[PDB]
Protein backbone atom coordinates (compact mmCIF):
# COMPACT_ATOMS: atom_id res chain seq x y z
CA UNK A 1 0.00 0.00 0.00
CA UNK A 2 2.82 2.36 -0.93
CA UNK A 3 2.65 6.16 -0.99
CA UNK A 4 4.14 8.39 -3.65
CA UNK A 5 6.74 11.07 -3.04
CA UNK A 6 4.88 13.70 -5.02
CA UNK A 7 1.83 12.98 -2.87
CA UNK A 8 3.88 13.24 0.33
CA UNK A 9 5.41 16.56 -0.74
CA UNK A 10 2.00 17.89 -1.76
CA UNK A 11 0.58 16.90 1.63
CA UNK A 12 3.36 18.74 3.44
CA UNK A 13 5.11 15.95 5.30
CA UNK A 14 8.58 17.36 4.56
CA UNK A 15 7.82 20.36 6.79
CA UNK A 16 9.06 20.02 10.37
CA UNK A 17 9.35 22.06 13.55
CA UNK A 18 11.56 25.05 14.24
CA UNK A 19 15.26 24.29 14.35
CA UNK A 20 15.52 25.12 18.06
CA UNK A 21 12.98 22.47 19.08
CA UNK A 22 14.76 19.69 17.18
CA UNK A 23 16.14 16.47 18.58
CA UNK A 24 19.72 15.68 17.57
CA UNK A 25 18.59 12.07 17.64
CA UNK A 26 16.47 13.14 14.68
CA UNK A 27 19.48 14.73 13.05
CA UNK A 28 19.93 11.75 10.66
CA UNK A 29 16.33 12.09 9.44
CA UNK A 30 16.72 15.75 8.42
CA UNK A 31 17.47 17.26 5.02
CA UNK A 32 17.83 20.98 5.63
CA UNK A 33 16.48 24.06 7.37
CA UNK A 34 14.51 26.48 5.19
CA UNK A 35 13.72 29.83 6.82
CA UNK A 36 14.79 28.52 10.26
CA UNK A 37 12.47 25.47 10.01
CA UNK A 38 13.68 21.88 9.63
CA UNK A 39 12.89 19.87 6.51
CA UNK A 40 12.57 16.10 6.94
CA UNK A 41 14.32 14.00 4.30
CA UNK A 42 11.54 12.33 2.31
CA UNK A 43 14.11 10.23 0.44
CA UNK A 44 14.88 8.44 3.69
CA UNK A 45 11.24 8.67 4.82
CA UNK A 46 9.61 6.64 2.04
CA UNK A 47 11.62 3.39 2.46
CA UNK A 48 11.18 3.49 6.24
CA UNK A 49 7.46 4.11 5.83
CA UNK A 50 7.25 1.24 3.34
CA UNK A 51 9.08 -1.12 5.72
CA UNK A 52 6.71 -0.20 8.55
CA UNK A 53 3.73 -0.67 6.25
CA UNK A 54 4.96 -4.11 5.19
CA UNK A 55 5.33 -5.21 8.80
CA UNK A 56 1.85 -3.88 9.63
CA UNK A 57 0.36 -5.64 6.61
CA UNK A 58 1.93 -8.94 7.66
CA UNK A 59 0.55 -8.53 11.19
CA UNK A 60 -2.94 -7.74 9.89
CA UNK A 61 -2.80 -10.70 7.51
CA UNK A 62 -2.01 -12.91 10.49
CA UNK A 63 -4.89 -11.17 12.34
CA UNK A 64 -2.90 -8.80 14.50
CA UNK A 65 -4.68 -6.29 16.70
CA UNK A 66 -3.41 -2.86 15.64
CA UNK A 67 -4.06 0.00 18.06
CA UNK A 68 -4.09 3.52 16.60
CA UNK A 69 -2.88 6.04 19.18
CA UNK A 70 -3.63 9.63 18.29
CA UNK A 71 -4.64 12.26 20.83
CA UNK A 72 -4.07 15.61 19.13
CA UNK A 73 -7.51 17.16 18.74
CA UNK A 74 -6.86 17.89 15.07
CA UNK A 75 -5.95 14.25 14.34
CA UNK A 76 -8.37 12.60 16.78
CA UNK A 77 -11.27 12.49 14.33
CA UNK A 78 -9.08 11.18 11.54
CA UNK A 79 -7.41 8.47 13.60
CA UNK A 80 -10.79 7.26 14.88
CA UNK A 81 -12.21 7.18 11.35
CA UNK A 82 -9.19 5.25 10.05
CA UNK A 83 -9.35 2.69 12.86
CA UNK A 84 -13.02 1.95 12.37
CA UNK A 85 -12.62 1.98 8.57
CA UNK A 86 -10.15 -0.89 8.84
CA UNK A 87 -12.09 -2.44 11.76
CA UNK A 88 -9.36 -1.79 14.32
CA UNK A 89 -9.09 -0.31 17.80
CA UNK A 90 -8.13 3.26 18.65
CA UNK A 91 -7.52 5.77 21.43
CA UNK A 92 -8.44 9.24 20.16
CA UNK A 93 -8.61 11.00 23.56
CA UNK A 94 -6.15 11.17 26.48
CA UNK A 95 -4.12 7.99 26.87
CA UNK A 96 -4.91 6.72 30.36
CA UNK A 97 -1.72 6.01 32.27
CA UNK A 98 -1.27 2.27 32.26
CA UNK A 99 -3.91 1.43 29.70
CA UNK A 100 -1.81 -1.57 28.66
CA UNK A 101 0.50 -2.11 31.65
CA UNK A 102 -2.49 -1.81 34.03
CA UNK A 103 -4.73 -3.83 31.78
CA UNK A 104 -6.56 -5.67 34.55
CA UNK A 105 -7.89 -2.38 35.89
CA UNK A 106 -8.64 -0.83 32.55
CA UNK A 107 -10.36 -4.17 31.81
CA UNK A 108 -12.67 -3.55 34.73
CA UNK A 109 -13.28 -0.06 33.33
CA UNK A 110 -14.22 -1.47 29.90
CA UNK A 111 -16.64 -3.91 31.56
CA UNK A 112 -18.25 -0.97 33.35
CA UNK A 113 -18.53 0.95 30.07
CA UNK A 114 -20.09 -2.03 28.30
CA UNK A 115 -22.64 -2.54 31.08
CA UNK A 116 -23.61 1.14 31.12
CA UNK A 117 -23.95 1.28 27.33
CA UNK A 118 -26.02 -1.92 27.27
CA UNK A 119 -28.32 -0.54 29.96
CA UNK A 120 -28.67 2.75 28.06
CA UNK A 121 -29.71 1.25 24.76
CA UNK A 122 -30.82 -2.36 25.16
CA UNK A 123 -31.97 -2.02 28.78
CA UNK A 124 -35.11 0.06 28.17
CA UNK A 125 -35.32 0.40 31.96
CA UNK A 126 -37.24 3.73 32.03
CA UNK A 127 -36.89 4.05 35.82
CA UNK A 128 -34.29 6.81 35.85
CA UNK A 129 -35.48 9.49 38.35
CA UNK A 130 -33.74 11.91 35.95
CA UNK A 131 -30.87 12.03 38.46
CA UNK A 132 -29.85 8.41 37.99
CA UNK A 133 -30.13 8.80 34.22
CA UNK A 134 -27.98 11.93 34.26
CA UNK A 135 -25.27 10.27 36.37
CA UNK A 136 -25.36 7.11 34.26
CA UNK A 137 -25.20 9.18 31.06
CA UNK A 138 -22.24 11.21 32.31
CA UNK A 139 -20.38 8.01 33.19
CA UNK A 140 -21.25 6.49 29.81
CA UNK A 141 -20.13 9.58 27.89
CA UNK A 142 -16.84 9.83 29.77
CA UNK A 143 -16.10 6.14 29.32
CA UNK A 144 -17.03 6.19 25.64
CA UNK A 145 -14.77 9.18 25.03
CA UNK A 146 -11.79 7.64 26.83
CA UNK A 147 -12.07 3.93 25.96
CA UNK A 148 -14.62 3.79 23.13
CA UNK A 149 -12.14 2.49 20.58
CA UNK A 150 -10.62 -0.30 22.68
CA UNK A 151 -13.96 -1.45 24.11
CA UNK A 152 -14.17 -4.37 21.66
CA UNK A 153 -10.41 -5.08 21.70
CA UNK A 154 -10.76 -7.79 24.31
CA UNK A 155 -7.07 -8.17 25.05
CA UNK A 156 -3.80 -6.31 24.37
CA UNK A 157 -2.75 -5.16 20.89
CA UNK A 158 -0.11 -6.86 18.77
CA UNK A 159 1.13 -3.53 17.36
CA UNK A 160 0.82 0.14 18.28
CA UNK A 161 0.73 2.74 15.48
CA UNK A 162 1.37 6.09 17.16
CA UNK A 163 0.97 9.67 15.92
CA UNK A 164 3.91 11.67 17.35
CA UNK A 165 6.10 9.87 19.88
CA UNK A 166 6.90 12.95 21.97
CA UNK A 167 3.22 13.78 22.42
CA UNK A 168 2.16 10.18 23.05
CA UNK A 169 5.31 9.25 24.96
CA UNK A 170 3.55 7.49 27.85
CA UNK A 171 1.94 5.05 25.42
CA UNK A 172 5.32 4.42 23.77
CA UNK A 173 6.87 3.61 27.16
CA UNK A 174 4.01 1.28 28.09
CA UNK A 175 4.38 -0.57 24.79
CA UNK A 176 8.14 -0.86 25.29
CA UNK A 177 7.66 -2.27 28.79
CA UNK A 178 5.27 -4.92 27.48
CA UNK A 179 7.30 -5.59 24.32
CA UNK A 180 4.66 -4.68 21.73
CA UNK A 181 6.03 -3.39 18.41
CA UNK A 182 5.62 0.35 17.91
CA UNK A 183 5.21 2.08 14.53
CA UNK A 184 5.54 5.75 15.34
CA UNK A 185 5.47 8.80 13.13
CA UNK A 186 8.31 10.92 14.48
CA UNK A 187 8.70 14.63 13.76
CA UNK A 188 11.98 16.47 14.16
CA UNK A 189 11.25 17.46 17.77
CA UNK A 190 10.49 13.87 18.81
CA UNK A 191 12.91 11.24 20.13
CA UNK A 192 12.98 8.04 18.02
CA UNK A 193 14.78 5.77 20.49
CA UNK A 194 11.76 4.03 21.99
CA UNK A 195 10.20 3.56 18.56
CA UNK A 196 10.76 0.29 16.70
CA UNK A 197 9.52 1.44 13.27
CA UNK A 198 10.32 5.13 13.04
CA UNK A 199 8.56 6.87 10.17
CA UNK A 200 9.89 10.44 9.89
CA UNK A 201 7.15 12.87 9.04
CA UNK A 202 5.00 15.81 10.03
CA UNK A 203 2.78 14.91 12.98
CA UNK A 204 1.32 18.44 13.06
CA UNK A 205 -0.23 18.96 9.63
CA UNK A 206 -3.70 17.53 9.20
CA UNK A 207 -3.37 16.51 5.56
CA UNK A 208 -0.13 14.67 6.37
CA UNK A 209 -1.81 12.92 9.30
CA UNK A 210 -4.69 11.89 7.04
CA UNK A 211 -2.26 10.53 4.46
CA UNK A 212 -0.43 8.43 7.06
CA UNK A 213 -3.70 7.14 8.49
CA UNK A 214 -5.13 6.31 5.09
CA UNK A 215 -2.09 4.39 3.89
CA UNK A 216 -1.90 2.41 7.14
CA UNK A 217 -5.63 1.68 6.92
CA UNK A 218 -5.23 0.45 3.35
CA UNK A 219 -2.41 -1.92 4.31
CA UNK A 220 -4.28 -3.39 7.31
CA UNK A 221 -7.40 -3.81 5.15
CA UNK A 222 -5.29 -5.59 2.53
CA UNK A 223 -3.98 -7.93 5.21
CA UNK A 224 -7.53 -8.67 6.33
CA UNK A 225 -8.57 -9.45 2.76
CA UNK A 226 -5.54 -11.77 2.32
Amino acid sequence: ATVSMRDMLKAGVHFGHQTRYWNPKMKPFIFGARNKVHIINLEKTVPMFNEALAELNKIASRKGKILFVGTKRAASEAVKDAALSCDQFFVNHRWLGGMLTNWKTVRQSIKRLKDLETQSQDGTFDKLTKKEALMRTRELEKLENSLGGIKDMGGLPDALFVIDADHEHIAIKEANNLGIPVFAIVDTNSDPDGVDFVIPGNDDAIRAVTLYLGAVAATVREGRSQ
Binding site: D87, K114, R224, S225, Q226
Partner: protein, 61 residues
Amino acid sequence: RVTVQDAVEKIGNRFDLVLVAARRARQMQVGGKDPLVPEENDKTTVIALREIEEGLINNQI
Protein backbone atom coordinates in the same frame (compact mmCIF):
# COMPACT_ATOMS: atom_id res chain seq x y z
CA ARG B 1 -34.88 -19.04 9.03
CA VAL B 2 -32.50 -21.97 8.54
CA THR B 3 -31.53 -22.80 4.93
CA VAL B 4 -28.18 -20.99 4.39
CA GLN B 5 -28.15 -21.08 0.56
CA ASP B 6 -28.77 -17.36 0.26
CA ALA B 7 -25.67 -16.83 2.37
CA VAL B 8 -23.84 -19.28 0.07
CA GLU B 9 -24.86 -17.08 -2.87
CA LYS B 10 -22.64 -14.51 -1.11
CA ILE B 11 -19.80 -16.78 0.10
CA GLY B 12 -19.36 -18.88 -3.02
CA ASN B 13 -17.44 -21.73 -1.44
CA ARG B 14 -19.78 -23.00 1.38
CA PHE B 15 -16.77 -23.98 3.49
CA ASP B 16 -15.84 -20.34 3.82
CA LEU B 17 -19.37 -19.73 5.02
CA VAL B 18 -18.73 -21.92 8.09
CA LEU B 19 -15.35 -20.30 8.72
CA VAL B 20 -16.88 -16.84 8.31
CA ALA B 21 -20.03 -17.53 10.32
CA ALA B 22 -17.90 -18.94 13.14
CA ARG B 23 -15.43 -16.02 13.05
CA ARG B 24 -18.24 -13.46 13.14
CA ALA B 25 -20.22 -15.28 15.81
CA ARG B 26 -17.01 -15.31 17.87
CA GLN B 27 -16.58 -11.57 17.44
CA MET B 28 -20.06 -11.39 18.99
CA GLN B 29 -19.89 -14.07 21.71
CA VAL B 30 -16.22 -13.63 22.64
CA GLY B 31 -14.90 -10.40 21.02
CA GLY B 32 -17.87 -8.51 22.53
CA LYS B 33 -19.10 -6.85 19.33
CA ASP B 34 -22.82 -6.69 18.48
CA PRO B 35 -24.72 -7.28 15.22
CA LEU B 36 -25.41 -4.95 12.32
CA VAL B 37 -28.62 -6.93 11.66
CA PRO B 38 -31.45 -6.39 14.18
CA GLU B 39 -31.12 -9.30 16.60
CA GLU B 40 -34.25 -11.02 17.96
CA ASN B 41 -32.37 -12.74 20.81
CA ASP B 42 -31.42 -15.45 18.32
CA LYS B 43 -28.34 -17.51 18.87
CA THR B 44 -25.14 -16.07 17.44
CA THR B 45 -25.37 -19.12 15.15
CA VAL B 46 -28.42 -17.54 13.52
CA ILE B 47 -27.38 -13.92 13.97
CA ALA B 48 -24.22 -14.49 11.97
CA LEU B 49 -26.19 -16.20 9.23
CA ARG B 50 -28.62 -13.22 9.35
CA GLU B 51 -25.54 -10.95 9.04
CA ILE B 52 -24.81 -12.51 5.63
CA GLU B 53 -28.38 -11.52 4.56
CA GLU B 54 -27.53 -7.85 5.10
CA GLY B 55 -24.70 -8.37 2.58
CA LEU B 56 -22.08 -6.73 4.83
CA ILE B 57 -19.79 -9.67 5.82
CA ASN B 58 -16.77 -11.34 4.25
CA ASN B 59 -13.50 -12.70 5.71
CA GLN B 60 -11.87 -9.20 5.33
CA ILE B 61 -13.94 -8.19 8.36
